[PDB]
């Protein structure tokens, strides 16, 4: 075992030296010249009410008008963000739900939590009711994230340190992604739906290949858990948020760490991150009741989105029109 | 809402809100409890006395026309610091300890200490259950000692306020005072501990009722600055 450990150490060394050699100049030196964005003012335009307990997740639709939200009282609600109307109200079998997703075609929704099961709900039925169509079981830990690829393939993240790719038609895993040490907290798909990144409590992020089902790269630099991960609009970068009140920006081709967004007035960890349509603004939610908006190229604080409790989820519309946030006081606010 | 279809949509939304009101009224009149324990503790038999890799279990019981919901965690990993944040709003926590082993007691103490000082678990009062008293009673008179594990047992005597052999009572109150020593070290008067001496009973539900009653009363008194 000692020899194996020695080999691992030499292999690790043969990677840090290469990345340090390729490190070269940093983002700050090159991005200093560009005029700053200035200041950003955003005002609340809607307030969606009706959730009893606190909110953990929400997800926009592709039509840029509908959205779905999940709450601890055992309820899924689909809203109409323009007229503030309610379209559907779905009761769940279990009340400890942690995530929700909305299909790209708008035909299905999914949810899961402290029951090790991911459920699929069919919205367009001959009868005028929403009924469950498939229960996906096989995980050991709690479900922390789930995302659709199309109407038949879904990618789930669990607390048993593994990710999985499913087949909703048959309900059996077709691929398993092992390699993480701690429980996995979030995942983010790619625009071409060929790769996806992941974050876990072992303070590392990995990049996977869906087709062949094996890890390709590993990223480190954080000191504590990973709570949220987003992925650059271009497809060659991504950002993470941790429990040490810091956010990073990692490259794929360079395989290193770019500029870091941190400030001395934040002690609490980040719960969610998301980008803008052009990737110019990175905005993240915190535990100190607030939400901050950063400049993605200069790490300057530009704007504050000031909720009465912890902020748990974010979201940016596909055409970049609006931003939605959830919180533990059971209110959804839409900014613009 | 200038079109007919818009009016029908608004009416549908109003019906949904009425159903949500009904659900809210049902929800506000119920109390949730979280049950914790280990493999040696009889927390699996306490549930049955009150009464497929699932991740959580549920049990419902009623006393004096009040409904209680008690949730027992099922098949999970050994790490707890992540899914413990979903229970920061329960009425109380029921903690079960097996004080008849003399060996894993320090573990139970460490577990209790970690739960008590959690940032998200503040303002939650813990109800302590000391289970399997018959085993301890049978294991104390026969004479496996406590001096080797806890060196301070030699300088401990039964307090005058104890309400009871005398060695059995001294050992019980030593364990109880160790737990209470842990509990009272901090908390700044926002959550409390209610220890008990439980056996392998038809009164645990009543004890939970009374403890929850006292917890809610203290919270309401503190809210109005009457305490």
């Amino acid at each position, epitope marked *: 075992l000692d020899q194996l450990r020695q080999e691992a150490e030499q292999l690790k060394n043969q990677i840090r030296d290469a990345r340090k050699a390729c490190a070269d100049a940093t983002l700050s030196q090159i991005t200093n010249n560009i005029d700053p964005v200035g200041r950003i003012q955003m005002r609340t335009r809607r307030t969606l009410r009706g959730h009893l307990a606190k909110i953990y997740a929400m997800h926009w639709g592709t039509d840029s008008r509908l959205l779905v939200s999940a709450s601890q009282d055992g309820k899924l609600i689909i809203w109409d963000s323009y007229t503030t109307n309610k379209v559907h109200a779905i009761p769940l079998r279990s009340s400890w739900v942690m995530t929700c997703a909305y299909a790209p075609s708008g035909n299905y929704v999914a949810c899961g939590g402290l029951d090790n099961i991911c459920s699929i709900y069919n919205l367009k039925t001959r009868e005028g009711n929403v009924r469950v169509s498939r229960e996906l079981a096989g995980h050991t830990g709690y479900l922390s994230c789930c995302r659709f690829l199309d109407d038949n393939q879904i990618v789930t993240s669990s607390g048993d340190t593994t990710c999985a790719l499913w087949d909703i038609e048959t309900g059996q895993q077709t691929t398993t992604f092992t390699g993480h040490t*701690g429980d996995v907290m979030s995942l983010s798909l790619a625009p071409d739906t060929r790769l996806f990144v992941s974050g876990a*409590c072992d303070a590392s992020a990995k990049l996977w290949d869906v087709r062949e089902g094996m890890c390709r790269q590993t990223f480190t630099g954080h*000191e*504590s858990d990973i709570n949220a991960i987003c992925f650059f609009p271009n497809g060659n970068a991504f950002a993470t948020g941790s429990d040490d009140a810091t956010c990073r920006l990692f490259d794929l081709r360079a395989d290193q760490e770019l500029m870091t967004y941190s400030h001395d007035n934040i002690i609490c*960890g980040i719960t969610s991150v998301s980008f803008s349509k052009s990737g110019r603004l990175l905005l993240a939610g915190y535990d100190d009741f607030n939400c901050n908006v950063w400049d993605a190229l200069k790490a300057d604080r530009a704007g504050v989105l000031a909720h009465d409790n912890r902020v748990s989820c974010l979201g940016v519309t596909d055409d970049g029109m609006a931003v939605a946030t959830g919180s533990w006081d059971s209110f959804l606010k839409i900014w613009n | 809402t200038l079109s007919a279809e818009d009016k029908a949509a608004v009416e549908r939304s109003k019906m949904i809100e009425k159903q949500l009101q009904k659900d809210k009224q049902v929800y506000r009149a119920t109390h949730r409890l979280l049950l914790l324990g280990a493999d040696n503790s009889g927390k699996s038999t306490i549930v049955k006395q009150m009464r497929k890799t699932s991740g959580i279990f549920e049990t419902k019981f009623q006393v004096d026309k009040v409904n209680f919901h008690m949730f027992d965690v099922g098949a999970q990993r*050994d790490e707890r610091r992540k899914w413990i944040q979903c229970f920061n709003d329960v009425t109380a926590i029921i903690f079960v300890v097996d004080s008849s082993d003399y060996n894993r007691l*320090q*573990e139970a103490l460490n577990d209790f200490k970690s739960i008590w000082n959690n*940032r998200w678990l503040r303002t939650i009062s813990v109800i302590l259950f000391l289970n399997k008293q018959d085993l301890l009673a049978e294991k104390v008179l026969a004479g496996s000692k406590i001096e080797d594990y806890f*060196p301070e047992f030699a300088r401990y005597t039964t307090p005058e306020d104890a309400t009871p052999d005398p060695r059995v009572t001294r050992a019980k109150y030593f364990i109880r005072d160790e737990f209470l020593r842990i509990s009272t070290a901090s908390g700044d008067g926002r959550h409390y501990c209610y220890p008990h001496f439980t056996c392998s009973d038809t009164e645990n539900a009543r004890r939970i009722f009374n403890d929850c009653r006292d917890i809610i009363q203290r919270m309401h008194l503190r809210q109005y600055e009457l305490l």
Partner: nanobody, 123 residues
Framework: QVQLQESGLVQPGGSLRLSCAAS????????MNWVRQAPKGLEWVSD????????SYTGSVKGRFTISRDNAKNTLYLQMNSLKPDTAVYYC????????????????????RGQGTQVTVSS
């Protein structure tokens, strides 16, 4: 990432010094602990405060072992003394998040733990 290194047979009655070398994280902002495993489940031994204000020990080693760490070199070590017939590998550990009293550090590869060392106090 974060790496922790611990450096440490002795005839009974002896004493020893065992350290921890760590880099990657900010040492001055975290609670620390030593856990050892008997040839048995791992057991907690001696946590210390960020500035060292609070030190705690188990009954089996209270009065015989003392742990203290120095921020300057990001190293923490416990001065083992008067050993007794303690054959276990002693690991090192760090609490998961900075600035919090609470901590939960299991046999499932708690990431924030070192490989560990073995000490023999037998003949």
């Amino acid at each position: 990432q974060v790496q922790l290194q611990e450096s440490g047979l002795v005839q009974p009655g002896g004493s020893l010094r065992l350290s921890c070398a760590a880099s990657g994280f900010t040492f001055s902002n975290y609670k620390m602990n030593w856990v050892r495993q008997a040839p048995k489940g791992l057991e907690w031994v001696s946590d210390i405060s960020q500035s060292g204000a609070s030190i705690s020990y188990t009954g089996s080693v209270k009065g015989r072992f003392t742990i203290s760490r120095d921020n300057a070199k990001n190293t923490l070590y416990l001065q083992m003394n008067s050993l007794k017939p303690d054959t276990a590998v002693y690991y090192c550990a760090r609490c998961p998040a900075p600035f919090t009293r609470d901590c939960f550090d299991t046999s499932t590869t708690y990431a924030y733990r070192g490989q560990g060392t073995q000490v023999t106090v037998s003949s």
